[PDB]
Amino acid sequence: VNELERINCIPDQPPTKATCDQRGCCWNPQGAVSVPWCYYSKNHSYHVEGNLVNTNAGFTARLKNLPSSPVFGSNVDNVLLTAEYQTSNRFHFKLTDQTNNRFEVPHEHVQSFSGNAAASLTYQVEISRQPFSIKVTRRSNNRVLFDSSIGPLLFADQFLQLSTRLPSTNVYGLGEHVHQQYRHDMNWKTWPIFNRDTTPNGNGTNLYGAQTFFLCLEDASGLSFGVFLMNSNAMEVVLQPAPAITYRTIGGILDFYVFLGNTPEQVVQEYLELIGRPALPSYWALGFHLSRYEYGTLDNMREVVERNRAAQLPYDVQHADIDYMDERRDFTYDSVDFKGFPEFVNELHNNGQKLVIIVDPAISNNSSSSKPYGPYDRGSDMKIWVNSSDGVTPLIGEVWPGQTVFPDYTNPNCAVWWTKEFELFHNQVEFDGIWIDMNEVSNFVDGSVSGCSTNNLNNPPFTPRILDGYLFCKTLCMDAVQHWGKQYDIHNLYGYSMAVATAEAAKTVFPNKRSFILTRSTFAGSGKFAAHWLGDNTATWDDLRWSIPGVLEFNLFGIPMVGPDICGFALDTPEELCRRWMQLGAFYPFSRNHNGQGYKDQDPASFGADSLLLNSSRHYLNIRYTLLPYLYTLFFRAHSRGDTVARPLLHEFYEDNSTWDVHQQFLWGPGLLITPVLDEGAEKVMAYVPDAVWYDYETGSQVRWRKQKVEMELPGDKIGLHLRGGYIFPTQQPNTTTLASRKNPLGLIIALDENKEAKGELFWDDGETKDTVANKVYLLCEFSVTQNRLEVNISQSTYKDPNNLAFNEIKILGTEEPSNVTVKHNGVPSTSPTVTYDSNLKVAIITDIDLLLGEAYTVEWAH
């Protein structure tokens, strides 16, 4: 037994031969660091009893427990395996207790499979019976993708474990954590997953959300696969250099999906087809957002808003944190410090901006006839609180307002209550979107104001290595009771259920609009409802660097609108760090500068009306806004097809092994390469330039670099931005708000490849109506350039923007001088446009043209 393949039999304590012998495992203390001294033997677990049975969907097998001493308690004697060949690219298998119903995640999107095994499978499944293992191989090359035979199946009531070999070390995903790098360290690493309010720092703890998905790039051909575990109990995932991964959970069932794709993008698409593709955001949510904890007063907030508006900062959204509230209570505002809040909301709206308000789940229980607190009275009337273990008394904890009860968003009636609270509050403050926070759920006491009873839920036989080592730390008692079940089973689902309930509330408060929901805690599928931010980071260079893997991983998870707090939540931010973070932050799919309580101001204009930081911030935000039609179309593809938005280099450049661990650069979609300076004092960045033609975004000059590491010169006012040859990028003249920018002239940037060809697309709808994609009210056009000729081709034409939008500029990169430029409309000539040519840079710009959005054109030229 090769030491890299040993599966640890003593995860719970310092390894001893005595414990090893008792557990019937193998003892060998002579390995390298982290190699398990005690590891499972060749036959520990389950065997198949009798024959497999064909079903319409796949097959079932009965697994029988081989005799073994009970380590983490009540072992499951008869296990049922149910396997379903759900699609050509997705396999589903579950291990359940044959004679008892167990908790299964009540997911809102995923449904039970009815139907027949798919035809033309890209995979094969192989079951070994003595001892049990399950293998999933790729049919084309027989590559073993999933293979549980490396370790036992373990299945006790509060301890379930299965391992899989992996075909490579290119492993990406799992969450929510700060991994620091994007490609996984496979060198004996354990990642705990249990929704927790904790600082995203260098300690590798469980954080706000629970994401069990990972993607593996098998080799340079691009062939990739993914694995998702549908389980919401506390768990940890163990990575080792075999390479192999082990999932270790403390309840529910092992419900696994395996996805195959021809590229990393296709694996993500397969995962999202299962779990739910992300919502198409409101176009305004793609703009820049500004926020802080404790402006203190509306006057102070209003002063910040005004100096950034005075600076002409692209600036769509203002967030109001708990300081707007009357003593930190939801659905109120402070009538003294925030007197005139409704007038301020009108000011934002008149300026073409949006208000996003924070709402916390926990509700103050302080109410009397003397001073009623409406949300609590109404919630108690409807009996929609999380209860203590007696099943009848609302659990009391403590959050921002003091003592609180917690809504049980798993109860359908709770969404009715929540909806009414928002309707009532929206009648006072006409906010545009909702930021749901502290929804792990976060509790300032451990469990409840009276602690937690000692029992198998609060104190289980095995505890994954979660921060502080107790499940109820800074959250609710594990024996608290909700509609879907006990907190032990549904804790990781709280913020998911809250986001589902908040989207329901939006149906009434914002009829037929998308609005915007931003959530802290997530589960698999949360992106269908909400954006995410990476939580309470710190103003350090480490946090700046660590942000990029976090953004890429949430894109894998189908929450593409993701970003950190730009400049750093905790601590005063250094000018240089904030300047670099604003440059990079202009390109986070969710772009928000947010700051903690009491720290020095870090809004862009606070650095000086004429400062390098403000100038550069404005410059790069103006570039972001210019590329919004491109970014929005990327979101359209995430929503409709399941593509990533912020995308790892390796998803486009998988043939090139130098991209497999790149985490200091990323792409927008296939075509825009972003190269930030991430090191203090630096005016350079060591960067990778992939195997494509690349053009400097601002000058349009073709770089000489290709497929190579470079030292990119990036002075204090620059971030690297390069356009990929072969792509056509739709643009729109920027303005300080997207309300205004969407009325502006459009442009095309044609970045020619080595063959002088390029292709692109543009999605365009009204930017805010819900279901425009499902109801087919949108424009989708395709651009292609193949020598001497641009074609604009319309594939869907069921929305026509009333603002007379047209492409009034075409910039062609990598071209010899165009002559005789001719424009045809539906094949019919043809006015001569203006052409400007830079012969040193090989850039042509065509102007004095008006190609109406939604019409077919051909633009032809000679050389």
Ligand SMILES: *[C@@H]1O[C@H](CO)[C@@H](O[C@@H]2O[C@H](CO)[C@@H](O)[C@H](O)[C@H]2NC(C)=O)[C@H](O)[C@H]1NC(C)=O
């Ligand atoms: C939490 O406890 C409350 C009682 O405090 C339960 O309320 C019941 O709710 C239903 C309406 O759905 C009513 O038919 C019952 O009359 C209520 N019971 C009482 C005693 O008033 C509530 O069901 C509990 N929640 C959970 C998840 O168990």
Ligand SMILES: O=S(=O)([O-])O[C@@H]([C@H](O)[C@@H](O)[C@@H](O)CO)[C@H](O)C[S@+]1C[C@@H](O)[C@H](O)[C@H]1CO
């Ligand atoms: O006092 S804090 O440190 O700021 O509290 C944070 C943690 O709960 C934890 O660090 C401490 O409670 C334990 O020391 C909490 O997450 C802040 S919330 C999310 C943020 O984005 C909003 O601006 C804040 C107000 O709504």
Ligand SMILES: *[C@@H]1O[C@H](CO)[C@@H](O)[C@H](O)[C@H]1NC(C)=O
């Ligand atoms: C930009 O927006 C302002 C409103 O903030 C508007 O007055 C102005 O005309 C817009 N500029 C255009 C049309 O580019």
